């Protein structure tokens, strides 16, 4: 009576469906007393304004990961369920815009022209929705194109030690997509989405300036989640980037998505799991780290005529801090991905800058995503190199080896020097075909190692002037005729040396 | 030592308080009056549903004292100290738990026992009495200790019977016998 | 429904804990179905933890789960279809066609766990 | 603020206070424990609730008697800045070490910043 009245008086008097009162704060991860009805992965607006998604629905007390600071939070406040799982504006308005994780333009070109909203997770296109890939795309790096041909829909993991131009490898791909960008067709046009996770604002800002300089910022979308920005938001950042990608793909338009670096995504999810007290896996990266990565990566596709015709191309990037690929996170990713694009540090110093060590680089998808002409010319490029690797290994001793082995040794040396790539220079495939022809048909085997660099510049110039008929044809027909090969043979010979 | 060791997780501290109720031996009658306090908690459950609600601090302890003011005093000063202790440990979800456990200790001191004869189906009242009798005419109820034999219905526990009391059972069900028959005729 | 009605208690990931009704417990390696607009989410019972609260591992994906959500029990290991009518078609974990040549209609089904 | 509390536990240099107010000074606020050690500067990092916060202690916790009063600074430590801090060596508490007298400062700013 009096005790029941007084009981009602000291009682909250709310069923805490749609709401709950915070209890126990700290660690940037909250715990609420209440929230009896709650949907999973829903967004809950804490009444200190901060919003936090909910990842633990542990009995009676919901473990809500903040998207902001807890210094804003003060214990005992109400949190009221937004009732919406996280969603992002997606549109073509992202073209020439930097956006933060929640899609708020941090480039400050004001509100995105968002032709849709999407959901944090959107399931990958099935077996049947994909078209069987046959879409070539060329990065403008001859070694990449020739040795590990890139297609659209495939995942190729760029791996190698941190900031050894780790960023720069990716940006090179973007620059050669100018050739396609200029091109009218939407199937040609890659609307390229560069995701930068954990990276400092200054780095990104330099990058956008470089993109603006190279005038590609136009067809570029920059999705960013800088280091300061919240760990849930970092985890959520690839998946909402992915959603933007699926929209392009759905539209029939092609795109390419760079996920640099997934390694910091893992650390973010690690932080969450260890402060949600969820069981931490090997290297303290949680047990369902694989689940996140696999779903993200398998969203990449090329679609058939069932839906669209677009294809999102993916380039995941893992920067191996230890350089250890047998570590849990690289290992998991390596299994997921269709390729590895291993880089070697020693070879960076050796003067290939960027340096790609193609011993551990694979593309299982292969040369169906390689231009027919380019398949022909780089056909025995691989054989020569493979022989060179073995031959070179014995050869360092300094002994005068048998001549047959030194035919390999001499040819092989020239090839490596020929391959060498310089930062910020993408190469036109039409003018990558001659160089690989020349080398493979051994016209440069004789040409001294020292002057290979000199010869290359001049050779292109000489062809540009004289055998410009050849260049047009390589572009136009994309497969080299016997006649064209012969013409090319004569041409290479014609420029006997510089 | 209290009659029967509960193992005493949380509520076992209150079982030791029941040992103290034997020590200041009016606490044995205090276990009857504390059962009356549990009856007050049984009138409580609209407020008891609020009482499972967390976060009542010193104000929660004062609110519990207000419920105690609605009470007449069953379980006395030991019960009041338990109200403070449970308040201090802040848990209503092991409030009734202590009640049930104190009940077990209390009725152990009384010497009442609880048996059960789970069967596939209900059993005769003639059967009920005859087994209670039998148990008294066995060492199981040595007599000096009461019994509350409860037949339970569980058709999942197949035909026949299983008698349970203490750590002692006779299981003359069908399933176990069928199992044995099968095994040997697969051998 | 089923008398083996459980209400989710904790979604902390794939682990989803369910609070089945007292005395009406399932068994290890059972398959729970939860009716959902995604079909029926299947949770494989992997532990009993006490007082008809199980801890089960999800098979299929999760999201939007309402904590306290009624859980029906299939009662045992996932039952696939078996037959020579399983020949020449794509089947998935719960046995659903991916080639979508309609349901894999078969005379018999079998459990996933077998000795 | 004049929110006092007492020190319930002293587990390492991670003291736990039990504030009397159910308003618990927000995360990254600063607290002064009033002692013959002057103040001890603590910074609330968790609220463990029950009106018992758990606080990082920046200054040494030696000699602490359990149940020792706290006072709430009420926010992140306010440093002393100025152009007259040029030529001063400051401790963590923001006080001389080179004893160029009391820090000439106009504006005092929260340690944490966005």
UniProtKB/Swiss-Prot annotation, chain A:
One GO cellular component, as annotated: mitochondrial nucleoid
Phosphoserine PTM sites in chain numbering: 11, 132
Subunit note: F-type ATPases have 2 components, CF(1) - the catalytic core - and CF(0) - the membrane proton channel. CF(1) has five subunits: alpha(3), beta(3), gamma(1), delta(1), epsilon(1). CF(0) has three main subunits: a, b and c.
Gene Ontology molecular functions: ADP binding; ATP binding; proton-transporting ATP synthase activity, rotational mechanism
Matching NCBIfam families: atpA, PRK13343.1
Protein name: ATP synthase subunit alpha, mitochondrial
Site feature Required for activity, where: 361
ATP-binding among keywords: yes
InterPro entries the UniProt entry points to: ATP_synth_asu-like_sf, ATP_synth_asu_C, ATP_synth_asu_C_sf, ATP_synth_F1_a_nt-bd_dom, ATP_synth_F1_asu, ATPase_a/bsu_AS, ATPase_F1/V1/A1_a/bsu_N, ATPase_F1/V1/A1_a/bsu_N_sf
Keyword terms, alphabetized: ATP synthesis, ATP-binding, CF(1), Hydrogen ion transport, Ion transport, Membrane, Mitochondrion, Mitochondrion inner membrane, Nucleotide-binding, Phosphoprotein, Transit peptide, Transport
Binding site for ATP: 160-167
Compartments reported by the entry: Mitochondrion inner membrane
Gene that specifies this protein: ATP1
One record GO biological process: proton motive force-driven ATP synthesis
Additional observations: Present with 41500 molecules/cell in log phase SD medium.
Entry function: Mitochondrial membrane ATP synthase (F(1)F(0) ATP synthase or Complex V) produces ATP from ADP in the presence of a proton gradient across the membrane which is generated by electron transport complexes of the respiratory chain. F-type ATPases consist of two structural domains, F(1) - containing the extramembraneous catalytic core, and F(0) - containing the membrane proton channel, linked together by a central stalk and a peripheral stalk. During catalysis, ATP synthesis in the catalytic domain of F(1) is coupled via a rotary mechanism of the central stalk subunits to proton translocation.
Family under the similarity heading: Belongs to the ATPase alpha/beta chains family.
Curated annotation (Swiss-Prot), chain B:
Protein name: ATP synthase subunit 5, mitochondrial
One Pfam match: OSCP
More info: Present with 32400 molecules/cell in log phase SD medium.
Gene: ATP5
Subcellular localization, as worded in the UniProt entry: Mitochondrion; Mitochondrion inner membrane
Alphabetically ordered keywords of this record: ATP synthesis, Hydrogen ion transport, Ion transport, Membrane, Mitochondrion, Mitochondrion inner membrane, Transit peptide, Transport
GO cellular component terms attached to this protein's record: mitochondrial inner membrane; mitochondrion; proton-transporting ATP synthase complex
GO MF term list: proton-transporting ATP synthase activity, rotational mechanism
Organism phylogeny: Eukaryota, Fungi, Dikarya, Ascomycota, Saccharomycotina
Swiss-Prot record, chain C:
Modified residues (Phosphothreonine): 74
Annotated signal peptide: none
Location relative to the cell: Mitochondrion; Mitochondrion inner membrane
Domain of life: Eukaryota
Other remarks on this protein: Present with 164000 molecules/cell in log phase SD medium.
Quaternary organization: F-type ATPases have 2 components, CF(1) - the catalytic core - and CF(0) - the membrane proton channel. CF(1) has five subunits: alpha(3), beta(3), gamma(1), delta(1), epsilon(1). CF(0) has three main subunits: a, b and c.
Function: Mitochondrial membrane ATP synthase (F(1)F(0) ATP synthase or Complex V) produces ATP from ADP in the presence of a proton gradient across the membrane which is generated by electron transport complexes of the respiratory chain. F-type ATPases consist of two structural domains, F(1) - containing the extramembraneous catalytic core, and F(0) - containing the membrane proton channel, linked together by a central stalk and a peripheral stalk. During catalysis, ATP synthesis in the catalytic domain of F(1) is coupled via a rotary mechanism of the central stalk subunits to proton translocation.
Recorded family membership: Belongs to the ATPase alpha/beta chains family.
Protein name: ATP synthase subunit beta, mitochondrial
Organism: Saccharomyces cerevisiae (strain ATCC 204508 / S288c)
Full protein stretch here: 39 to 153 of 511
């Amino acid at each position: 009576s009096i005790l029941e009245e007084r009981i009602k008086g000291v009682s909250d008097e709310a069923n805490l469906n749609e709401t709950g009162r915070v209890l126990a704060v700290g660690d940037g991860i909250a715990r609420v007393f209440g929230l009896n009805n709650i949907q999973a992965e829903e967004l809950v607006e804490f009444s200190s304004g901060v919003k936090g998604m909910a990842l633990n629905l542990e009995p009676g007390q919901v473990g809500i990961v903040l998207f902001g600071s807890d210094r804003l939070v003060k214990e005992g406040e109400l949190v009221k369920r937004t009732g919406n799982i996280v969603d992002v504006p997606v549109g073509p308005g992202l073209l020439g815009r930097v956006v933060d994780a929640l899609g708020n333009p941090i480039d400050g070109k004001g509100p995105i022209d968002a032709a849709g909203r999407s959901r944090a997770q959107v399931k990958a296109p099935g077996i049947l929705p994909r078209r069987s890939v046959h879409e070539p795309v060329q990065t403008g790096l001859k070694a990449v194109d020739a040795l590990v041909p890139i297609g659209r829909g495939q995942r190729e993991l760029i791996i190698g030690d941190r900031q050894t131009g780790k960023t720069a490898v990716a940006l090179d791909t973007i620059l050669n997509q100018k050739r396609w960008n200029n091109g009218s067709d939407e199937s040609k046009k890659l609307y390229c989405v560069y995701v930068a996770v954990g990276q400092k604002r200054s780095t990104v800002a330099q990058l956008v300036q470089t993109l603006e300089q190279h005038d590609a910022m136009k067809y570029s979308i920059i999705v960013a989640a800088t280091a300061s920005e919240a760990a849930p938001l970092q985890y959520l950042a690839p998946f909402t980037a992915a959603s933007i990608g699926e929209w392009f793909r759905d539209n029939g338009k092609h795109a390419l998505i760079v996920y640099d670096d997934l390694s910091k995504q893992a650390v973010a999810y690690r932080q969450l799991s260890l402060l949600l007290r969820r069981p931490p896996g090997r290297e303290a990266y949680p047990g369902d780290v694989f689940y996140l990565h696999s779903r993200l990566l398998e969203r990449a596709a090329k679609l058939s005529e069932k839906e669209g015709s677009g294809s999102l191309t993916a380039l995941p990037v893992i920067e191996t801090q230890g350089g250890d690929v047998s570590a849990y996170i690289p290992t998991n990713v390596i299994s997921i991905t269709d390729g590895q694009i291993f880089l070697e540090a020693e070879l960076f110093y050796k003067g290939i800058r960027p340096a790609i060590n193609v011993g551990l680089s694979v593309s299982r998808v292969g040369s169906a995503a390689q231009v027919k002409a380019l398949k022909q010319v780089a056909g025995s490029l691989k054989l020569f190199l493979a022989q060179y690797r073995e031959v070179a290994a014995f050869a360092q001793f300094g002994s005068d080896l048998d001549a047959s082995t030194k035919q390999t040794l001499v040819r092989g040396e020239r090839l490596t020097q020929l391959l060498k790539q310089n930062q910020y220079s993408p190469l036109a495939t039409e003018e990558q075909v001659p160089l690989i022809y020349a080398g493979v048909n051994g016209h440069l085997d004789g040409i001294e190692l020292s002057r290979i660099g000199e010869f290359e510049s001049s050779f292109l110039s000489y062809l540009k002037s004289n055998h410009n008929e050849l260049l047009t044809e390589i572009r136009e027909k994309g497969e080299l005729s016997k006649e064209l090969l012969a013409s090319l043979k004569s041409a290479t010979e014609s420029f006997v040396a510089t | 030592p209290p009659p029967v060791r509960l193992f005493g997780v949380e509520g076992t501290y209150a079982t030791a308080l029941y040992q103290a109720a034997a020590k200041n031996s009016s606490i044995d009658a205090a276990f009857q009056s504390l059962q009356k306090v549990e009856s007050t908690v049984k009138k409580n459950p609209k407020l008891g549903h609020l009482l499972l609600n967390p976060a009542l601090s010193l104000k929660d302890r004062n609110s519990v004292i207000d419920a105690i003011v609605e009470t007449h005093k069953n379980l006395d000063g030991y019960v009041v100290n338990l109200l403070k202790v449970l308040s201090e440990n802040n848990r209503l979800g092991c409030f009734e738990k202590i009640a049930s456990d104190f009940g077990v200790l209390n009725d152990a001191h009384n010497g009442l026992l609880k048996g059960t004869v789970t069967s596939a189906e209900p059993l005769d009242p003639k059967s009920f009495k005859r087994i209670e009798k039998a148990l008294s005419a066995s060492k199981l109820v040595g007599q000096g200790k009461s019994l509350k034999l409860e037949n339970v219905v569980k058709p999942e526990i197949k035909g026949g019977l299983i008698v349970e009391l203490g750590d002692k059972t006779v299981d003359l069900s069908i399933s176990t016998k069928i199992q044995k028959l099968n095994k040997v005729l697969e051998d | 429904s089923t008398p083996i009605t459980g209400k989710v208690t904790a979604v902390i990931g794939a682990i989803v804990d369910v609070h089945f009704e007292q005395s009406e417990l399932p068994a290890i390696l059972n398959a729970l179905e939860i009716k959902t607009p995604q079909g029926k989410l299947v949770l494989e019972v992997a532990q009993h933890l006490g007082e008809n609260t199980v801890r089960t591992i999800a098979m299929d994906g999760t999201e939007g789960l309402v904590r306290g959500e009624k859980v029906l029990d299939t009662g045992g290991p996932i039952s696939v279809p078996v037959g020579r009518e399983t020949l020449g078609r794509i089947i998935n974990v719960i046995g659903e066609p991916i080639d979508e040549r309609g349901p894999i209609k078969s005379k018999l089904r079998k459990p996933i766990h077998a000795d």
